[PDB]
C-alpha cells in the first residue's frame, strides 16, 4: 500500500477496511528500513490510531493500531512526543485491562517503549495511572502458569519503569512496584532474574531512602543467593545491585553482611570476567570504608590476602578499586585491623603502584601509608614501618615523587618524609 490508501481506508468508515489500511501501515512502518513517519504522521493518522485503540468490538484493530504507534514512537524524540501528544498513553492504559491476552501484552510492551523513551515519558506513564493495572496483570492466580514472553514483557515495562534518572522514579511508584518485584525474583526463567536484578540495580543507584526501600522489601537474602549463580547474567546485576547498597548506610552494609555476601567474595575477586573482579572489588572498597566490625567481618571472611592479591596482580582499573579498598581500611580501621593489614603484605603492592600517572591514586597511597604510621605511632613502632618500606625499594619511590612538575605529589612524598623518613 501507500501512504495515500492508508489514508483513504483509514478514513473510510467502514471497518474492515479501516483494519486492513491500518495493518497496512504497521506492515509498511515495519518492513521499510526507513518508513515515512513523518508524512503518516502529517495526515493526522495518530489520532486516528489512538481512537481505533477503543475498539474493543474489534481485538484486531486494537492491536494493530497499539504496533503502529509503537513503530512511531520508536523513532525520533519529535515522533514520540507526536504519539503521546496524540492521547495514546491512557488509551493504551485502558487497554491494559482487555480480556484478551495478546492485546493487553501488546498495551504493556507499548507503553514499556514509551516510558523507556526517557524519563519525561516515564513519568507521564506514571501519572496516567498505569501501575496498578500493569501490576494486577501480574496478580494472577498462579504466576508459574504465565507464559515465558508474557511475564518477560511485564517484567521489562516494569523495569523501564524502574529506570531513568534526572528526574528519578517518584518514591511512591517505587514503593508501589518493589514487591512485585520480590515475588518475580523467585522465578524460575533467566530473563525475567535478569531483568528484575537489573530494576533492583536501577533502584539502588540513588539515595539512601531508595536504598531503604529496596532492603526493606527483604530482597538481599535472594541477591546474595544469585550471586553464586552460575549465570553471568544473573550474577552481573545482583553484584550490581549489591555494591550500590553498600554505597548506603552503614546498617543497610550490615544488612547485606548479615545476608551471607561476604564467603561468597573470595571466588568474585578472582573471577576470571575483568568486570566482576571490578565489581566485587569495588563492592569490598565500600565494605571496608563501614564500621569497624564490618572491616573485622571482611578479615574474618579471610578476604584480606585475596585483596592483596588483586591488588598485585590485577589491572589498572581493577588495582585502583583495590587502593580505595585498601585506603578505606587504613583510615577506619583498628590498629589491631591496621597491623593484620600490613602482616598480610600491604606495603610491597602499594609502593609498586606508586609508579602510577594518577595524581589522585598517588595521593591516596600516600595517604593510606601515613594512616598506617599513625597506627604505627599509636603503638611505638613507627621505625619498623620505616625499615619495612626501605627494604622493598618503597622509600625510593617516594623519593622519585620529589618532583615539582607535580607540586601535590611533591608537597605529599616530602612531608611523609620528613615525618618517617628522617
Known amino acids: 500500500?501507500?501512504?495515500?490508501?492508508?489514508?483513504?481506508?483509514?478514513?473510510?468508515?467502514?471497518?474492515?477496511?479501516?483494519?486492513?489500511?491500518?495493518?497496512?501501515?504497521?506492515?509498511?512502518?515495519?518492513?521499510?528500513?526507513?518508513?515515512?513517519?513523518?508524512?503518516?504522521?502529517?495526515?493526522?493518522?495518530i489520532p486516528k490510531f489512538v481512537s481505533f485503540l477503543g475498539?474493543?468490538?474489534?481485538?484486531?484493530?486494537?492491536?494493530?493500531?497499539?504496533?503502529?504507534?509503537?513503530?512511531?514512537?520508536?523513532?525520533?524524540?519529535?515522533?514520540?512526543?507526536?504519539?503521546?501528544?496524540?492521547?495514546?498513553?491512557?488509551?493504551?492504559?485502558?487497554?491494559?485491562?482487555?480480556?484478551?491476552?495478546?492485546?493487553?501484552?501488546?498495551?504493556?510492551?507499548?507503553?514499556?517503549?514509551?516510558?523507556g523513551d526517557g524519563s519525561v515519558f516515564r513519568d507521564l506513564v506514571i501519572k496516567y495511572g498505569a501501575i496498578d493495572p500493569l501490576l494486577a496483570l501480574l496478580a494472577v492466580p498462579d504466576m508459574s502458569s504465565l507464559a515465558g514472553g508474557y511475564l518477560r514483557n511485564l517484567t521489562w515495562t516494569l523495569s523501564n519503569l524502574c529506570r531513568n534518572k534526572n528526574p528519578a522514579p517518584p518514591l511512591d511508584a517505587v514503593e508501589q512496584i518493589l514487591p512485585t518485584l520480590v515475588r518475580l525474583l523467585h522465578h524460575n526463567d533467566?530473563?525475567?532474574?535478569?531483568?528484575?536484578?537489573?530494576?533492583?540495580?536501577?533502584?539502588?543507584?540513588?539515595?539512601?531512602?531508595?536504598?531503604?526501600?529496596?532492603v526493606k522489601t527483604g530482597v538481599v537474602p535472594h541477591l546474595v543467593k544469585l550471586l553464586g549463580?552460575?549465570?553471568?547474567?544473573?550474577?552481573?546485576?545482583?553484584?550490581?545491585?549489591?555494591?550500590?547498597?553498600?554505597?548506603?548506610?552503614?546498617?543497610?552494609?550490615?544488612?547485606?553482611?548479615?545476608?551471607?555476601?561476604?564467603?561468597?567474595?573470595?571466588?568474585?575477586?578472582?573471577?576470571?570476567?575483568?568486570?566482576?573482579?571490578?565489581?566485587?572489588?569495588?563492592?569490598?572498597?565500600?565494605?571496608?570504608?563501614?564500621?569497624?566490625?564490618?572491616?573485622?567481618?571482611?578479615?574474618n571472611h579471610g578476604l584480606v590476602p585475596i585483596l592483596v592479591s588483586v591488588l598485585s596482580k590485577a589491572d589498572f582499573k581493577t588495582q585502583k578499586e583495590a587502593v580505595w579498598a585498601v585506603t578505606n581500611y587504613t583510615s577506619g580501621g583498628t590498629v589491631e585491623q591496621i597491623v593484620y593489614l600490613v602482616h598480610c603484605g600491604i606495603i610491597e603492592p602499594l609502593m609498586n603502584l606508586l609508579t602510577a600517572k594518577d595524581t589522585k591514586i598517588i595521593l591516596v597511597i600516600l595517604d593510606a601509608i601515613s594512616n598506617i604510621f599513625?597506627?604505627?605511632?599509636?603503638?611505638?613502632?613507627?621505625?619498623?614501618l620505616s625499615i619495612?618500606?626501605?627494604?622493598?625499594?618503597?622509600?625510593?619511590?617516594?623519593?622519585?615523587?620529589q618532583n615539582h612538575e607535580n607540586e601535590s605529589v611533591y608537597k605529599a612524598s616530602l612531608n611523609l618524609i620528613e615525618k618517617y623518613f628522617s
Open 229 to 299: 549463580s552460575n549465570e553471568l547474567s544473573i550474577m552481573t546485576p545482583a553484584l550490581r545491585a549489591i555494591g550500590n547498597i553498600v554505597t548506603g548506610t552503614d546498617e543497610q552494609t550490615q544488612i547485606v553482611i548479615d545476608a551471607g555476601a561476604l564467603a561468597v567474595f573470595p571466588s568474585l575477586l578472582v573471577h576470571p570476567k575483568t568486570n566482576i573482579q571490578k565489581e566485587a572489588t569495588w563492592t569490598m572498597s565500600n565494605i571496608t570504608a563501614g564500621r569497624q566490625d564490618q572491616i573485622q567481618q571482611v578479615v
Open 55 to 115: 475498539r474493543t468490538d474489534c481485538s484486531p484493530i486494537q492491536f494493530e493500531s497499539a504496533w503502529a504507534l509503537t513503530n512511531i514512537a520508536s523513532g525520533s524524540s519529535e515522533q514520540t512526543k507526536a504519539v503521546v501528544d496524540g492521547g495514546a498513553i491512557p488509551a493504551l492504559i485502558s487497554l491494559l485491562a482487555s480480556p484478551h491476552a495478546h492485546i493487553s501484552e501488546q498495551a504493556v510492551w507499548a507503553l514499556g517503549n514509551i516510558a
Open 374 to 384: 599513625q597506627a604505627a605511632e599509636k603503638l611505638g613502632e613507627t621505625e619498623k
Open 190 to 214: 533467566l530473563e525475567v532474574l535478569a531483568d528484575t536484578c537489573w530494576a533492583i540495580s536501577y533502584l539502588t543507584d540513588g539515595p539512601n531512602e531508595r536504598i531503604e526501600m529496596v
Open 388 to 401: 619495612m618500606i626501605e627494604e622493598c625499594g618503597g622509600l625510593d619511590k617516594i623519593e622519585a615523587l
Open 1 to 45: 500500500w501507500t501512504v495515500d490508501d492508508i489514508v483513504k481506508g483509514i478514513n473510510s468508515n467502514n471497518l474492515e477496511n479501516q483494519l486492513q489500511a491500518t495493518q497496512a501501515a504497521r506492515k509498511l512502518l515495519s518492513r521499510e528500513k526507513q518508513p515515512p513517519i513523518d508524512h503518516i504522521i502529517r495526515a493526522g493518522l
